[PDB]
């Protein structure tokens, strides 16, 4: 996260770390949506241009975390994956359309003060909240300074970072880029004049964009961190997978297995 701050403890108890077994690496963010299901971006697992294609045994999931690199001994939980599900029309050839994936855990996680699922939106929640100008919040352990062009200064955080960013309108999203934007994406971020800054960055992809409902005080995940051009470049924006539009796919797969 660029221009964010450190998270409070337990502030985002659905944040998950995607962790490669060998070498031990942070791969991506993710999120916990029930005791057994994790949501992330498909590009975290499957990306042919860069010869990326992870399977279940390549990875661990780590839940309950705050520190990026410590093993948080009686706080975090580490889980093995049972099954990865990628959207069957994810578009890695062109624009990362349908950048979504579900991971099934081997055994259910127990919840605690630090481990707690987020909600997925319903139609009326999506409708009321997903408006230009409304802010949501992005969290993660990825770089502090741009690496699309490697940046110095500080590099990597020690703790989970957080930033709040406004939804931007669709025409400005589309006029900021040469990529074909779909209805399965939204963008977010401050406009160059607005004075405030901030963005996701490498290592943040796959994590949550969440919003808090003013009607029932719950947190909903509206976006997944997907792609962007650089990090915190003026006149550019972050693009997020639109979680509600892909919700039928999500419930299709979690209903078909299955207890």
């Amino acid at each position: 996260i660029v221009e964010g701050s450190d998270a409070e403890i337990g502030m985002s108890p659905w944040q998950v770390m995607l962790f490669r077994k060998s070498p031990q690496e942070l791969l991506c963010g993710a999120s916990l949506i029930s005791d057994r299901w994790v949501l992330t971006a498909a590009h975290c697992l499957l990306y042919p241009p860069w010869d990326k294609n992870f399977t279940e045994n390549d990875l661990l999931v780590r839940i309950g975390k705050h520190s990026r690199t410590r093993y948080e001994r009686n706080i975090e939980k580490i889980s093995m994956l049972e099954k990865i599900y990628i959207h069957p029309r994810y578009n890695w050839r062109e624009n990362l359309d349908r950048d979504i994936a579900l991971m099934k855990l081997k055994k259910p996680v127990a919840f605690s003060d630090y481990i707690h699922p987020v909600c997925l939106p319903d139609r009326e929640t999506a409708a009321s909240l997903l408006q230009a100008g409304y802010k949501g919040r992005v969290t993660g352990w990825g770089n502090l300074k741009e690496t699309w062009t490697a940046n110095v200064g500080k590099g990597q955080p020690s703790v989970l970072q957080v930033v709040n960013l406004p939804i931007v309108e669709r025409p400005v999203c589309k006029d900021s880029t040469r990529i074909r934007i779909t209805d399965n994406m939204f963008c977010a971020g401050y406009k160059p004049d607005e004075g405030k800054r901030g963005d996701a960055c490498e290592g943040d992809s796959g994590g949550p964009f969440v919003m808090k409902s003013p009607f029932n005080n719950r947190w909903y995940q509206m976006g997944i961190v997907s792609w962007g051009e650089g990090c915190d470049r003026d006149g550019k924006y972050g693009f997020y997978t639109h979680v509600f539009r892909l919700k039928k796919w999500i419930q299709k797969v979690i209903d078909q297995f299955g207890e």
Partner: peptide
């Protein structure tokens, strides 16, 4: 219980 945090909400 989703979306209600133990240490906050």
């Amino acid at each position: 219980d989703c979306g209600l945090r133990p240490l906050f909400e």
